[PDB]
C-alpha cells in the first residue's frame, strides 16, 4: 500500500472517529497547505489530519500494524 501525497485547503476542525476513518494518506510538500497528514472517512470524505494531534498518529499507528495484521472485516 504505498499513497503519493494529495493535498487540501484546510486542517481538520477537530480529530475524527476511529469508527468513521478508513485510512490516512500523507503528504508531503512546500506548495500544499504546510506538513500534515489526510484522513478520509468511510461515507467517502477526506480531512487533512493534523500530525501535530495525536489521532492522526494514535491512528497512524494502528494503521501502520494491519502489516501483520489481515482482517478484511
Not at 468513521?20 to 487533512?48: D, E, H, N, P, W
Request: hydrophobic residues 30%.
Amino acid at each position: 500500500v504505498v499513497i503519493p501525497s494529495p493535498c487540501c485547503m484546510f486542517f481538520v476542525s477537530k480529530r475524527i472517529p476511529e469508527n468513521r476513518v478508513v485510512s490516512y494518506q500523507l503528504s508531503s510538500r512546500s506548495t500544499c497547505l504546510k506538513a500534515g497528514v489526510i484522513f478520509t472517512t468511510k461515507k467517502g470524505q477526506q480531512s487533512c489530519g493534523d500530525p501535530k494531534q495525536e489521532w492522526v498518529q494514535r491512528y497512524m499507528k494502528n494503521l501502520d500494524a494491519k502489516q501483520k495484521k489481515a482482517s478484511p472485516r
